[PDB]
Each structure stands twice: as C-alpha cells, then as structure tokens.
Design a protein around this ligand. Structure first.
Ligand SMILES: Cc1cc2nc3c(=O)[nH]c(=O)nc-3n(C[C@H](O)[C@H](O)[C@H](O)COP(=O)(O)OP(=O)(O)OC[C@H]3O[C@@H](n4cnc5c(N)ncnc54)[C@H](O)[C@@H]3O)c2cc1C
Ligand SMILES: Cc1cc2nc3c(=O)[nH]c(=O)nc-3n(C[C@H](O)[C@H](O)[C@H](O)COP(=O)(O)OP(=O)(O)OC[C@H]3O[C@@H](n4cnc5c(N)ncnc54)[C@H](O)[C@@H]3O)c2cc1C
Ligand SMILES: NC(=O)C1=CN([C@@H]2O[C@H](COP(=O)(O)OP(=O)(O)OC[C@H]3O[C@@H](n4cnc5c(N)ncnc54)[C@H](OP(=O)(O)O)[C@@H]3O)[C@@H](O)[C@H]2O)C=CC1
Ligand SMILES: NC(=O)C1=CN([C@@H]2O[C@H](COP(=O)(O)OP(=O)(O)OC[C@H]3O[C@@H](n4cnc5c(N)ncnc54)[C@H](OP(=O)(O)O)[C@@H]3O)[C@@H](O)[C@H]2O)C=CC1
Ligand SMILES: N[C@@H](CCC(=O)N[C@@H](CS)C(=O)NCC(=O)NCCCCNCCCNC(=O)CNC(=O)[C@H](CS)NC(=O)CC[C@H](N)C(=O)O)C(=O)O
Ligand SMILES: N[C@@H](CCC(=O)N[C@@H](CS)C(=O)NCC(=O)NCCCCNCCCNC(=O)CNC(=O)[C@H](CS)NC(=O)CC[C@H](N)C(=O)O)C(=O)O
Lengths: 488, 488
C-alpha cells in the first residue's frame, strides 16, 4: 500500500496548516493541504492561514488596538496633552485599508512558504470525502460541481473549523456577521451587535471606537447577563464599564423581524415588541462546526450535535486513519489549541512517540475594550465538583486613572482555590494588560500552583500584576456548594 | 524592663511603614514611626510614605505614562486617527500639578491612618541614636539642634533608605538629581541626563516626552554600554531603540566642569574635552545608603562600604535589638523587597515564628520608554557558576507596528537555562507590557521552573507573552563558561 500523499489536510487553518507543515519538514512525509482560496476574501472569507489569520484573531486584534486609541487620546488630555479635541476624527477607511495591507502580506508569506518547502503542496478547492483514502477536490461546495483533483492518501485530517450561526427569523439575510464586519466599506453610525459572546463584545468595542458623530452602539442579548462562562463578578463589572464607555447594553432582548427602508438602513423589531433603526446589524450568535458539505456520511465519520466531528483524546475519528482538529471537533475553540491538537497528532502518528492535549487550565482572553484574562474553573463550577473552596477578591483602580479622568477602569482579580489543599483552580482578571499577565498565570496553574505559591513571591512595585501576590485572607468561602462566610 | 515603645521605626519608608503598621495592628505592640516631614516636599524631599511614594516609583510612573503618550498619539495617526499634527503640545505644568494632586492625596490618606490606628504614632524630626534602647528626635541633621523628643524603646528599625550620589567636580552643585527633577518649574528644552542607571534612563524617557519644540535629550555615561547588570543583548537593543526614539545616547563620556551662563543655562565640559549648553543637567550616579547622619557609632552598629548597615539574613544588626531594612542595607534596593524584609522582621521578632527573605529570583522592572522585564541570572553569570547552560532567544516585531509606523519597537525575549537540570535561571524581556508579564514569570521561577515547563503550556493567542511557551530550539550554549553552538 504505497499511496500518492502521506497526508491530506482539509483546511489551511491555524490547526491544519501547523500539522501539514510539521509532518513535511521534521518527518518529511508527503503532505497536501486543501483550502478554499488564495488570500483573505470578500466572496469566500477564510483562506490560506485559517479563520484566525483572515477573519479572526489577527485582523480583529488590529481593529481593537485602533479603537482603543479613542480612550487613550481623550485620556492624554489630563496629562497635559492639549490639542484641538475636535481636530479629531477616526477614519475607518484608512483602518481597513491598512488592515488589508497587513493580512495580505501574511497571505503572501504563506504562498512563498509552499514554494520553498519540499513535501508541501497547496491544493485549492472544496474538499470532500469519497472514502477513507480518497479525497475529492471540487470547485463548488455544491456536490454536483466539477471534479478538479482526486488525491490518494494514507491519512486525512479535517481542519475546516467553524462557521457563523445565523438565527432563523424574517430578515435574517439583512444582517451581517463577523465575516462581513471586516469588509464594511464605511463606519456604521447607528449600530446593533446581537448576542453576548467573545465576538459580540469585542466587536461592540470596535464600532464604539470608529463611530462618527452622533453614532452609537447597542448590544442586545437574549439572557440577563453577558458572556456566560466567565467569573460572574467579572461579567457584571464589564457591563458597567462598557456602559460607561458608551456601549448601550440591553439584556433579555432579542429581535424577531428585520426589514429594509427607503434609505437602505435596516429596521429592527424586538422581543419586547419595539422598533429601532440601525445602519447595520451584526449577528454574533456563535459558530457551528463546518462539516455541512464534507460528506462524512459517504466515508463513515460520526457527527454529533450540529456536525461536531467526534474524536478520541488523540484527535482520531470513527475511522482508524481519519482525524479532525480545531473548531470542527467542538472542544474548546481557540487558535493555540487547534495548534496543539495538530502538533500532538504529528508526534503521535508520524513521530511514533504519541501524545494528547491538555484541555483544562487553558488560559484564554476576551479582547473587549477592557480586556479579560481568565484561566481555570469558574467560581460556580469549582464550587460544584470541589468540596471546600475559597474566593480571593481584589478590585483596585490604578494610579493613572485619577488623572486620565476614567475613574471607572478599575482593575479586577478573582482567585478560586481548593480550601482542602490550597490549590489554585481559577484566576480571573478584568483590566488593561490582563491578557498579557494571565498567560504566565496559565503556566503556573498547569504547573499546579497554590495560593501560597502566589503571595510568597516578591513583586514588581508599580505593576498591576503585583497585586496577584497580595491576596492572603480570602473574601469568602464555598462549603460543599453553598454561600458561606466562616468554617467552624 | 517595661519601656514606652515596643518598637521605634526610624523612617516612614515603604519598608518602614509596613513594619510599623504590622506590629501595631496584627500584634498590637506599641510602635512609633519617625520621619522628616508630613507631605511630599521640595525643601526636604521624602516624607511620610517613603522615597517611593514621594520622590520615587509612584510619581515617577505617572510621568512615564504621560511621556508614553507622545508615541501613542503619533502612532494612532496610522490607524486612521486624523487630526492637527501640530495642535498637539505637551504642558509640563498641568502634569506636575496633576502629579501633586495625586501624591498629596496619598500623604493625606496616611495622616488619617495614624489617627485611626491604636498603637501607631508619627513623630516628626531627624532620628539619631543615644544608645541601644534610646532614640533621639532632633529638628536638624545638625547634632547641635534642639532635642525635640526622646523615645524609650525595646526595638529600633532603621528604614532611612538611600540618598542621591553626587560626583565631585567643579559645578557639581549646579546640577539637579532624581529629587529636584520632580519639581522643575518648566519642561527643559536642552537636557542632559548623566549616568546609565534605572533613573538615568527612565528619566531620559520622561523629558524626551515633555520636551517642547526643538528640544532634545542627551544621555551620557562613563562606561561603554548602558545599564550594566541586565541581559547584555537587551542592553544593546534598548540603546538602539532609545536612539530611534529621539534620545541621543553617548557612551564613554563624562563631564568635568560645569559653569553657569549669563542667560541662566548651565555649561558643560566633557571627558573628551568638548563643550555644550543645556538648560538643565540631572545626576543619576547612584544612591548611597542614608545613614551618614544617624550616629550609629555612638550605639555600636557597624557600617561598611559607604555606611551600608551590616545585617544578617534576618535583618539584625551589630546589636541584639537593632535592625535595618530597605535601601540602607545595600542588598539590591526596591520597594517590595523592603516590604518583605519589613514583614519578615515582624513575624521574626513579634510573630514568634522567625523568617528569612529570598533575595534571589526577584522579578524587577525598568520603566524606560520601552519597558524592561527581568528576573533571575544574566547570561554572563549563569555561564560562570553553573556548569553547562543554554540560551533561548526570540525577537519579533508585534502585529500593530507595521501600521503605527514604529517598525523599531521589536519585542525581545531571552531565557537562560541550566542544561543538565533544564532549570530556568533567568528571563529577560524588552517591550511594552514587559513589567506586567515578568511578574508571573517570577512566581514560576521561585516555584522552580524548566524550559520544558514553559513549552508544555498552551497560549493566549494574540499576545506577546504567548511567545514564552514557543521556545524549544536554543540559540546557543555556554559549556563551562564558553561560547558554543554544539555540545560534545
Ligand atoms: C472573529 C473571530 C475572532 C477570534 N479571535 C480569537 C482570539 O482572539 N484568540 C484565539 O485564541 N482564538 C480566536 N478565534 C478562534 C480561532 O480563529 C479558531 O479557534 C482557530 O483558528 C481554529 O482553527 P482550525 O484549525 O479549526 O482551522 P481554521 O483556522 O478555523 O481554518 C479552517 C480552514 O479550513 C478551510 N475550509 C473550510 N471548508 C473547507 C472545505 N470545504 N474544504 C477545504 N477547506 C475548507 C477554510 O477556508 C479555513 O481556511 C477567533 C475566531 C473568530 C471567528
Ligand atoms: C526616582 C526613584 C524611582 C524608583 N522607582 C522604583 C520602582 O519603579 N520600582 C521599585 O521597586 N523601586 C523603585 N525605587 C526604589 C524604592 O523607592 C526604594 O528601594 C524603597 O523606597 C526603599 O524603601 P525603604 O524601606 O529603605 O524606605 P524609603 O522608602 O526609602 O524611605 C525612607 C524614609 O526614611 C526617612 N528618613 C531618612 N533619614 C531619616 C532620619 N534622619 N530620621 C528619620 N527619618 C529619616 C525618609 O524621609 C524616608 O521617608 C525608586 C527610587 C527612586 C529614587
Ligand atoms: N478567545 C477569543 O478571543 C475568541 C474566542 N472565540 C471562540 O469561538 C466560538 C465562537 O462563538 P462566538 O459567536 O462568541 O459566540 P459563543 O457561542 O461564545 O457565544 C454565543 C453567544 O450568543 C448567544 N446566543 C446563542 N443563541 C442565541 C439566540 N438564538 N439568540 C440570541 N442570542 C443567542 C449565546 O447566549 P447563551 O450563553 O445564553 O447561550 C452566547 O452569549 C466560542 O465558542 C469561543 O470559544 C470566538 C471569538 C473570540
Ligand atoms: N526597579 C526600578 O524601576 C528602579 C530601581 N531603582 C533602584 O535604586 C537605585 C537607583 O539607581 P540610580 O543610582 O540610577 O543608578 P544605579 O547605581 O543602578 O546605577 C548607577 C549608574 O551611574 C553610573 N555611575 C556611577 N558612578 C559614576 C560616575 N562617577 N560617573 C559617571 N557615571 C557613574 C553607574 O555606572 P557603572 O555601571 O560603571 O557603575 C551606573 O550606570 C538602584 O540601586 C536600583 O536597584 C531605581 C529606580 C528605578
Ligand atoms: N497603586 C499601585 C501601586 C503603587 C502604590 O501606590 N504602591 C504602594 C506604596 S509604594 C501603595 O501605596 N499601595 C496602596 C495603594 O496604592 N492604594 C491605592 C488605593 C487606596 C487604598 N484603597 C482603599 C479603598 C479600599 N477599597 C474597598 O474596601 C472596596 N470598596 C470600597 O471602597 C467602597 C465601599 S464597599 N465601594 C465600592 O468600591 C463600590 C461602589 C460602587 N461603585 C457604587 O456605585 O455603589 C497599583 O495599584 O499598582
Ligand atoms: N505575531 C503575533 C502573534 C499573532 C500571529 O501573527 N500569529 C500566527 C497565526 S494566528 C502567525 O501568523 N505567526 C507568524 C508571524 O507573526 N510572523 C512574523 C515573523 C515572520 C518570520 N520571518 C521568518 C524569517 C526569520 N526572521 C528573522 O530571524 C528576523 N530578521 C532577520 O533575520 C533579518 C536579517 S539578520 N533582520 C534583522 O534581524 C534586523 C536587521 C537590523 N535592523 C539591521 O540594522 O541590519 C505576536 O507575536 O504578537
């Protein structure tokens, strides 16, 4: 059984690309990588690099940095930086323009990687499964399209990731998603972000920065508190700070109907039964795994709740040679996770020396206007399966914000510990420089640290991360899943 | 042997206060704290709070943040932030004035602490020693001054800290120091910073931000590479980045003569034998421990190199009941170290259960224009008293700086490891958010850490701190104090 390619990876995704690279360079296997298109695109959004390079973590990040400048400018005024506080206007155009110039060069970084690397080949189409060894390449997502290539391979790795979850309502097609968000010709005046997820909030922040005169940004959410899954004291405090930044939050509110007007703006009917007019409306409902058109059935790979490709703890699927990684798996959807799942796969099935991916004590971040950095268990979830738990709280407002006028940018820290052995189960932070600090916190937790480990370290005097080693006595306790003050 | 006070702390320093406070509240012992004045002051510089609150880290950091804005403003111009590129003018006055607003507020919250606390009292003057159990308070450093109080105590703690070193040359008195810098009437146009230490550099950054049109900021140094004591590759890259930021660095250069002009500026003669005119000239030569007035002799407490007070690792001096902490001890001098030495003291002699202070693997930071985060051993040092060592290096230029126009703000990391052990001995970083990241790095290293411990952790994707966990290949090695690439 000598086949054409040792591996065929579906998706140049941050997870897919990593795996395909690794196998061909360290292990010198023949690898073929399939993806939709060449560079970041308006008709098909993802491409060489993955969801995060083209329509995610990379371009998004730049836009959050750009919008963040709004505050910095007004703030500097308090430090003696005087100027015409109305010479100032944000040019959404020069942003997207300069954003595109950057993504483009990463796409042009990859193109040359492929022509420089022996064993790697990029094949452009729409991957589908014929059987366990044969991958078909089509020019359409439509199965009736043209047979462009047919690749015979020992292994198949699905890294197609995820895709916006639209909501089925009248006017659903009138909306935009995170995808079209990035290619909006002009900055929205009256803006509605819908939902309450990482992306809903990050983006709310962005439009709030690049809004023109009289512009505003509403954020509506089905539930009563945004960002379900984070420290419920961090969630509450962000809401305040977003409100104080200009983002009008609206909870327990969800549209039913959307219709276009004579000016071309979009009109919105609500859950409470009211109507408002927005230039634009973005859906951030979540992301269903992207296996819709792959025909896994045709080759026998078991899907689950909405196409989630079920895998073991080593990324293997229903078939002994087919694999899936990244977001399509439905485990925690992040770039550096997909990367790890990909690299572990490589060591396992090509390095001979197997390996599996640690899913807990993974630190992630929310690049909202005041960034969030968490790692570990929630306050609630640690109180569920752990017997005795301690809560350490500390909310301070840094020195500079007495001057900058933003006396609301209060930095927050929450530490959740197992009272029994003192172990640190979850750290949660709200404030600037939060995603930066939390990173090394995650090393400390996979290390297996304890609250003692923290305060027993000497700090750096003017930093905000020093207040991590300053929480000795706990704020309160959870004795077998109940709200407690004492213990005796 | 019942005495008036259990403790007399000789200096309301970072360490001074912490010590005094602790014993008075957690141990209810009677404490008296002696310092020079009440609020931050121009005639006598440090006051109730320490060399850090009044003429150190707290106000310093506010000014570094203000100078940081200059870049942030021009940088926003690339993100679409259009405005009058010359509406912008820094007002040095509104800064200093809003700086005092803050510092003064601290001094005001301290006053109220003393009135609020049973066992704590503030006594105002210049403390000297009468014997081992008697502290005298004078209204001058002059010993022929008036006896203002005389305190009968069981324990004395010397937290007088340190004091600027001037250099002995013609015109020495024409200069300013760390201290007077903070009260400069106006922003110095033609500016010279002298020496190559934390404050020499941090301050260089400050004036370079608040300089007015046409102004410049030179920096001269005796030696040929700035900041001896940090990673010799970080030291190089900073110099370059300062140069490119507007600061004219000059090595192997040291003034001899200073003479005032008939306009009011100061005139400078150099080591190379050249002449220049500067509006101001600030000395950042060093900080000699501040015991040169206390009469430790008349009590039997042994001074050393420049009055440094000799103490054991538990802070006890030549006498059984007298102690010294902070800068005056001449162990490496920072706020949180003085804080630890002071709290250790408390558990040691009042908590009953003794305690020592870990002086190594302390994470500190340099609040220069691009900040530095360092923790542990230098390259040159680990290459010495550790047999076989590895060097892990990685420099990247962050996502945003392709747009901001600062294609020179290259973030840098280098990790220093024991080969045999795998142990992480030193971590060094240059770039924005460095002091923040490094803090948790130091928790990891005191905890004992390995390069394998880093790359076994998953990352938070759009950060600079994530690049810590992506270093597997070493850049080169030190095989028993020798620069090598291979090993055998
Ligand atoms: C707006 C947004 C912001 C985000 N921000 C962050 C962040 O800040 N930090 C973070 O850690 N994560 C972030 N993420 C998540 C991150 O992008 C993903 O979790 C991660 O990139 C998933 O990688 P993957 O391996 O599944 O492949 P992906 O990176 O998702 O790429 C999948 C590839 O498969 C291709 N493909 C799709 N269908 C086919 C098919 N039919 N045939 C062949 N190829 C196909 C696509 O073209 C695409 O290139 C963000 C995501 C979004 C949407
Ligand atoms: C400009 C500057 C910036 C700094 N920045 C940082 C930084 O960013 N991070 C960091 O970690 N460290 C920084 N430091 C160092 C830090 O401030 C000190 O290491 C720390 O304050 C030492 O504390 P201490 O316990 O020795 O007492 P100190 O805080 O030094 O205070 C000593 C007190 O004793 C009093 N005193 C002196 N003589 C007498 C006497 N005759 N009688 C009675 N009282 C007396 C003084 O008035 C003073 O209030 C900085 C220092 C300076 C000068
Ligand atoms: N680390 C980062 O920076 C980022 C990570 N991601 C990852 O990628 C995935 C993409 O999800 P993204 O869109 O945030 O959203 P995720 O599902 O987190 O969030 C979805 C949000 O939409 C709400 N929602 C779901 N259905 C409806 C509905 N029918 N009507 C109204 N609201 C609804 C959900 O509410 P409810 O909680 O009540 O169900 C939830 O608040 C996430 O799982 C996340 O892990 C995405 C972006 C950035
Ligand atoms: N962590 C932080 O953010 C900060 C910490 N500090 C601490 O407090 C102290 C303050 O530092 P500060 O005194 O700048 O500098 P520190 O002594 O580090 O450095 C002194 C600098 O002055 C130079 N120098 C000494 N003598 C002369 C001379 N005669 N002529 C010319 N140059 C000379 C030294 O050069 P050479 O190397 O040849 O001796 C050295 O570069 C340090 O001990 C530090 O630990 C201070 C500020 C901020
Ligand atoms: N500050 C720097 C370090 C630099 C520094 O200053 N270091 C040392 C000396 S070198 C130092 O001085 N450290 C102490 C310090 O800097 N403190 C600054 C804050 C002042 C002290 N803080 C007192 C307030 C304590 N807070 C609380 O007890 C919390 N709650 C409240 O104060 C009130 C009453 S419960 N309500 C609220 O907070 C909620 C009110 C709500 N917004 C509403 O609308 O109702 C930092 O944070 O990094
Ligand atoms: N970059 C983000 C993370 C986000 C991100 O981009 N993530 C992923 C995908 S989600 C990604 O795309 N990563 C790739 C990336 O960001 N790459 C940027 C670096 C590209 C690497 N380039 C390869 C070539 C090796 N380069 C070098 O070693 C650096 N320079 C040099 O070798 C040359 C020649 S010595 N010049 C210099 O070193 C400078 C010379 C000096 N200025 C002079 O005066 O001469 C971050 O780090 O914050």
């Amino acid at each position: 059984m000598s086949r054409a390619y040792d591996l065929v990876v579906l998706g140049a995704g941050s997870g897919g690309l990593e795996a395909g690279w690794n196998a061909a360079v360290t292990h010198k296997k023949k690898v073929a990588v399939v993806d939709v298109q060449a560079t970041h695109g308006p008709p098909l959004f993802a491409a060489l690099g993955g969801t995060c390079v083209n329509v995610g973590c990379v371009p998004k990040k730049l836009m959050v940095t750009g919008a963040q400048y709004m505050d910095l400018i007004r703030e500097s005024g308090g430090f003696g930086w005087e100027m015409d506080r109305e010479s100032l206007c944000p040019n959404w155009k020069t942003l997207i323009a300069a954003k595109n110039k950057v993504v483009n060069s990463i796409n042009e970084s990859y193109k040359s990687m492929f022509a420089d690397t022996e064993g790697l080949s990029f094949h452009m189409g729409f991957g589908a499964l014929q059987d366990a060894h044969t991958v078909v390449v089509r020019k359409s997502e439509d199965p009736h399209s043209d047979v462009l290539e047919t690749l015979d391979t020992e292994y198949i790795l699905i890294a197609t990731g995820s895709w916006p979850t639209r909501l089925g309502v009248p006017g659903d097609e009138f909306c935009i998603t995170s995808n079209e968000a990035f290619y909006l010709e002009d900055a929205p005046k009256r803006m509605l972000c819908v939902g309450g997820g990482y992306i809903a909030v990050e983006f709310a922040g962005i439009f709030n920065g690049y809004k023109p005169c009289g512009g505003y940004v509403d954020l509506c959410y089905r539930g009563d508190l945004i960002l379900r899954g984070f420290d419920t004291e961090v969630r509450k405090s962000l809401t305040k700070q977003l409100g104080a930044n200009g983002i009008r939050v609206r909870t327990n509110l969800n549209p039913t109907k959307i219709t276009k007007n004579e000016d071309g703006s979009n009109h919105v009917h609500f859950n409470d039964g009211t109507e408002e007019d927005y230039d634009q409306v973005m859906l951030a409902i979540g992301r269903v795994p992207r296996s819709q058109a792959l025909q896994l059935d045709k080759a026998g790979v078991r899907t689950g709740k909405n196409g989630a490709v079920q895998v073991d703890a080593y990324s293997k699927t229903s078939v002994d040679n087919i694999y899936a990684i990244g977001d399509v798996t439905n485990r925690v959807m992040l770039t550096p996770v997909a990367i790890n799942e990909g690299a572990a796969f490589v060591e396992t099935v090509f390095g001979g020396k197997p390996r599996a991916t640690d899913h807990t004590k993974v630190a992630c971040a929310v690049f909202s206007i005041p960034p969030i950095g968490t790692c570990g268990m929630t306050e609630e979830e640690a109180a569920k399966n752990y017997e005795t738990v301690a809560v350490y709280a500390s909310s301070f407002t840094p020195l500079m914000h007495n001057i900058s006028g933003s006396k609301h940018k209060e930095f927050m820290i929450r530490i959740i510990t197992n009272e029994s052995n003192g172990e640190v189960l979850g750290v949660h932070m709200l404030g600037d420089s939060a995603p930066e600090i939390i990173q090394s916190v995650g090393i400390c937790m996979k290390m297996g640290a304890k609250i003692s480990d923290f305060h027993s370290t000497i700090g750096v005097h003017p930093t905000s991360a020093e207040e991590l080693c300053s929480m000795r006595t706990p704020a309160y306790f959870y004795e077998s899943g109940k709200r407690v003050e004492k213990l005796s």
